[PDB]
Subunit: 161 residues, 3 copies
C-alpha cells in the first residue's frame, strides 16, 4: 500500500482542509487509525460520515491497519492516514508499517494539556511519542494546507521544553 | 450535551424535513436512539446513509446514549435525537438524560395500529408511553416543519381514546 | 421484497455506472451481499461510503439477506443487489431468495484468473457457479449500462471452455 501522507488531527474531517490534501495527492482512500475510535460505535460512524464522496473512507485499529498495509488486496493503493495522536503512529510502526513523514495538523487544547502552537496542544505522553518519532527517523512537519510553508515541528517542540 | 430537539419519526432521514430542523437549530450531530436499530447491521447503515453532509450522524442504543449524554467528550455539543417511538424516549429518561420537549413527527400506519393524525399511528404500548411522558412533565408537540404551527399532541391524543 | 436487478461487480460503487441502473429502476436501496465484506470492518464501510445519497445502502451476508428478503418490514421495497462473484448468488438462492436474472458487470483480472471478456475474469470456482446458475434457470446477461445491448453471457462463456 502506498501511504502518501500520515496526518495528526484531533478534529478529523473538518472543513475543506482534508479535501485539499486529497486533491493534491490524488488518494483513493482515507483511513482513520485509532484503537479507541474503532471500538466506539458512536464515534466510528460519526467520524466517517462527513468525509467527501468519490473517496472511500474507513476507520480501523492499529492492528488491522498493520494487517491491511501488507495485504495483497490493497497492493499499490494510494492512501492517506489520519491519527488522533503520535502514540498510535508509534504503535503502528511497531507493527511493520513504515511511515516516512507525519504532518502535524492539530491537537485541541484541554485543561491538562500544554499549548505548543496555535493548533497543537500536548500532554506528557504526546511529547515522549513525538521524541520516539524523531528517533525512528520520522520527519515531523507542521502545516494545515498544502500551500502553507512546511515548518519544522521538532525545532518548535524543543524550544518549548 | 445540549439536546436541542428530541423527535419521533418512523421514516428517519426522509426528504428535506430533518434538514430544515437542523439549519434552524444549527446542530452538529444527529443521533438515532433505538436498541433495535443499533443491533441490526442492515438497518443502522441504511438509516445513516441518507443523512446530510456537514452533519455528523450515528446510531446508538438507549444505553450508550445515556452514557454519551454525560460523557465529557461531547460536553457542550449541540445535538438532535431521532426516535422510532415514545418508549425508547421513556427508557432514555430512566437512564438520566433530561428531555424537555419531544416533537412528534410521524409513526406510520400498520394493520394493528390506530391512526390518530394524518401522520401518527399508535398501538397500545405507544399510548401508555405518551402518557408516562406527560407524567414526567415532557411537553409533547406535533409538527413536521419549524414553520408549521405547533399543535398540542396531548389534547389530540386524549380526544381519541 | 422486490429485487429489480442482481448484479455482479468486483469494483462496486465505481463511476456513474451503478447510479444509472438506479435511476432506471427507481430503487430505494442498494445492498451488497457478501459474507467476506460483511465481516470485514475496513471493507464494509469503505464500500458503502461512495454510494449515492437519496439512496439507502448497506452490506449484509448471504444469511441476513435471506432473512431480510422474507422479513415483513421490507415488504414491497424495491432493491438492487451487488455481488462480488456468482457463488454467493448460488448461496443466496439456496436460502430461499428467487433471483430471476443476473447482470454480469465485471470481475477484475488477476494472475490466477482467466480473462473471458474485456471486463470479466473468472477462476474455476466462478465457472462452476455460472453453470449452476443456468441450471437453476437464472438468465445471465452481460452489460455495463442500461443502454448497452444485452449480450448473452452463457453463449460467451461456453465459446471459451
Amino acid at each position: 500500500m502506498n501511504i502518501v501522507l500520515a496526518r495528526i488531527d484531533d478534529r478529523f474531517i473538518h472543513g475543506q482542509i482534508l479535501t485539499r490534501w486529497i486533491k493534491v495527492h490524488a488518494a483513493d482512500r482515507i483511513i482513520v487509525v485509532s484503537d479507541d475510535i474503532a471500538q466506539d460505535e458512536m464515534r466510528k460512524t460519526l467520524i466517517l460520515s462527513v468525509a467527501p464522496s468519490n473517496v472511500k473512507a474507513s476507520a480501523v485499529s492499529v492492528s488491522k491497519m498493520a494487517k491491511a498495509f501488507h495485504s495483497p488486496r490493497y497492493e499499490g493503493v494510494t492512501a492517506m492516514l489520519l491519527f488522533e495522536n503520535p502514540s498510535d503512529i508509534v504503535s503502528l510502526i511497531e507493527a511493520g508499517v513504515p511511515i516516512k513523514t507525519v504532518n502535524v495538523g492539530g491537537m485541541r487544547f484541554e485543561n491538562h494539556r500544554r499549548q505548543i502552537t496555535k493548533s497543537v496542544s500536548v500532554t506528557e505522553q504526546d511529547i515522549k511519542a513525538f521524541e520516539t518519532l524523531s528517533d525512528k527517523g520520522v520527519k515531523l512537519e507542521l502545516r494545515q494546507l498544502p500551500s502553507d510553508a512546511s515548518e519544522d515541528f521538532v525545532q518548535i517542540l524543543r524550544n518549548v521544553t
